[PDB]
Amino acid sequence: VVGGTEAQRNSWPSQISLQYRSGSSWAHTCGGTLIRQNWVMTAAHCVDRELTFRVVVGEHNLNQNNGTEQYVGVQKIVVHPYWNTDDVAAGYDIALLRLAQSVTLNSYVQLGVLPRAGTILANNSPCYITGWGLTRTNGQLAQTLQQAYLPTVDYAICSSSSYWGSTVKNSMVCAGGDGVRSGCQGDSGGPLHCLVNGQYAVHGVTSFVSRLGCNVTRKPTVFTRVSAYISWINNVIASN
Ligand SMILES: [Ca+2]
């Protein structure tokens, strides 16, 4: 997250870190949202590589013992069947991970609340992106979980020519674009939390930014629109 502030430890308890085994250690690669005690919602593109993955819940600082973490292997990966790795702009950047064990809920570990199916946010709705991704374009991952206030940019504006044009689909949510604050590599798969009727819900799964850089004016961060996938999500969890 570029232009973020450090999140309080208990603000976003559905945020997870998706990590892959790298030698004798584990490397953060993406965010995710805990949606059942044994299912995480993330981005399809985060799990294209043939890696060994684990999820960490109750995580705050990737580089130090927080006293709150639970580490769990990934037992099954269900990518949206329409996803195509060579075409992020087509959409469908969403995947569910069934965890090998059910995690224990507490102040640091809670299920993310999802929007009702089809819900579209009005332009300029208040949302926060969270994650441990790069804190600058071509920078380094965050140690501590970061948040950045990224108001939505509606489909009409976002798909206009000076924004993302044809690249953005109505199955996506755009947010930010101010040239200062944005997601960045390593935030993919994580939540966009938006305040609606007094309650935060996870409206986006972080998907992409500009090839030109993370924080680029009129290139808001782009997210898979969670509310486009409620039936798909329910179908997967019920069949698995
Ligand atoms: Ca930690």
From Swiss-Prot:
Similarity section: Belongs to the peptidase S1 family. Elastase subfamily.
Protein name: Chymotrypsin-like elastase family member 1
Catalytic activity: Hydrolysis of proteins, including elastin. Preferential cleavage: Ala-|-Xaa
Lineage: Eukaryota, Metazoa, Chordata, Craniata, Vertebrata
Record-annotated Peptidase S1 domain positions: 1-238
Pfam family membership, one: Trypsin
Cysteine pairs bridged by disulfides in the record: C30-C46, C127-C194, C158-C174, C184-C214
Class of the enzyme per the UniProt entry, highest EC level: hydrolase
SMART domains per UniProt: Tryp_SPc
Biological processes annotated in GO: proteolysis
Enzyme Commission number, as recorded: 3.4.21.36
Tissue distribution of the protein: Pancreas. Basal layers of the epidermis, hair follicle and sebaceous gland epithelia (at protein level).
Cofactor(s) this protein requires: Ca(2+)
InterPro entries: Peptidase_S1_Elastase_sf, Peptidase_S1_PA, Peptidase_S1_PA_chymotrypsin, Peptidase_S1A, Trypsin_dom, TRYPSIN_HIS, TRYPSIN_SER
Keyword Transferase among UniProt keywords: no
A cellular-component GO term for this protein: extracellular space
Residues bound to Ca(2+): E59, N61, Q64, E69
Native species: Sus scrofa
Cofactor note: Binds 1 Ca(2+) ion per subunit.
Gene Ontology MF, one: serine-type endopeptidase activity
Keyword entries, A-Z: Calcium, Disulfide bond, Hydrolase, Metal-binding, Protease, Secreted, Serine protease, Signal, Zymogen
Annotated localization: Secreted
Coiled-coil annotated residue ranges, if any: none
Record function comment: Serine proteases that hydrolyze many proteins in addition to elastin.
Residue positions of the active site: H45 (charge relay system), D93 (charge relay system), S188 (charge relay system)
